[PDB]
Design a binder for this molecule. Structure first.
Ligand SMILES: [Ca+2]
Ligand SMILES: [Ca+2]
Length: 316
DNA sequence: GTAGACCTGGACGC
DNA sequence: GCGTCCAGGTCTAC
């Protein structure tokens, strides 16, 4: 009845999705800087907001186990087939990770070695507004801090959903909320630092200059090139943040976010250096060259392979 | 095209 | 003991 559910404590309220560990490891996907919305509130059980409801997820060897908290309006019950489809879409489970790992390991002997220890790193398919603003909060920052900033943002500006134990979950804020008066100041007091202004300015820029939510949503059907360029108009969004949004919310599997983590990987594990620029270190030209190097290496799902090596780089 | 400032807070050095 | 370096970079200025 009370508290976050576990598979043992409320057996009747879980449904499953067939899903081998080769296809998904929650512990390597959820806390690794794709989504900041999930916490392991009981060992091996991950809770967070997915498609505007709270869920807890946990896995056995062949199954992803899902439970959904709706309110108070009904009465607790197992997830419905439609609700389970939402989970499948968020994890993009139609994409067969074992196939991609095989392809990348065949063209890249170092990937093949890492892959063996880091199975099941796949990419979530995120809502565009939640992805956009969360990655705006991510620049020049670390995942533990970013996670708290996002939580406090949703608490202050998003709709309350439900409370489990002492944890209240909220939906991601709308553009309207984020574009409202005095939002920057309130975000400063929530510890967002200089990105407080970027969040307010992009929410306004989007509603009042770009065409609203439709402008962002329609980038899903635009080309990578067009989507990336569109996104860099926004305050706090440079090439790397834009790439993260392209990859993680706008269905551009070839997008490769290039930052110092990716330079470390490139130099340590590929002995890479820039060819077509004079600069020895990160710059707009050298970062652009590095992203192209990863696409040439891995092919059209290069940003997915980048997510495997990035998740591995965090486990130091 | 280069270079350094910048909110915040944990790790680590002397 | 603050002092500095760093973390899913972007913005601003010769
Ligand atoms: Ca950084
Ligand atoms: Ca920008």
């Amino acid at each position: 009845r009370m508290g976050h559910r576990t598979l043992a404590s409320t057996p009747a309220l879980w449904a499953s999705i067939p899903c081998p560990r080769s296809e998904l490891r929650l512990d390597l996907v959820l806390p690794s800087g794709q989504s900041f919305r999930w916490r392991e509130q009981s060992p091996a059980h991950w809770s967070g907001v997915l498609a505007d409801q709270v869920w807890t997820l946990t896995q056995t060897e062949e199954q992803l186990h899902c439970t959904v908290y709706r309110g108070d309006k009904s009465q607790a019950s197992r997830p419905t087939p439609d609700e389970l489809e939402a989970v499948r879409k968020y994890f993009q489970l139609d994409v067969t990770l074992a196939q991609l790992y095989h392809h990348w390991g065949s063209v890249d002997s170092h990937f093949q070695e890492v892959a063996q220890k880091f199975q099941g790193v796949r990419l979530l398919r995120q809502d565009p507004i939640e992805c956009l603003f969360s990655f705006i909060c991510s620049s020049n920052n670390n995942i533990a801090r970013i996670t708290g900033m996002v939580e406090r943002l949703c608490q202050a500006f998003g709709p309350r959903l439900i409370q489990l134990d002492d944890v209240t979950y909220h939906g991601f804020p709308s553009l309207q909320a984020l574009a409202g008066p005095e939002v920057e100041a309130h975000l400063r007091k929530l510890g967002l630092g200089y990105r407080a202004r970027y969040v307010s300015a992009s929410a306004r820029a989007i509603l009042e200059e770009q065409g609203g939510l439709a402008w962002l949503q329609q980038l899903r059907e635009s080309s990578y090139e067009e989507a990336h360029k569109a996104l860099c108009i926004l305050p706090g969004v440079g090439t790397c943040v834009a790439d993260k949004i392209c990859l993680m919310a706008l269905d551009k599997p070839q997008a490769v976010p290039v930052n110092v983590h990716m330079w470390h990987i490139a130099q340590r594990d590929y002995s890479w250096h820039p060819t077509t620029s004079q600069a020895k270190g990160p710059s707009p030209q050298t970062n652009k060259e590095l992203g192209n190097f990863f696409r040439s290496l891995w092919g059209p799902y290069a940003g997915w392979a980048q997510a495997v090596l990035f998740s591995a780089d965090l486990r130091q």
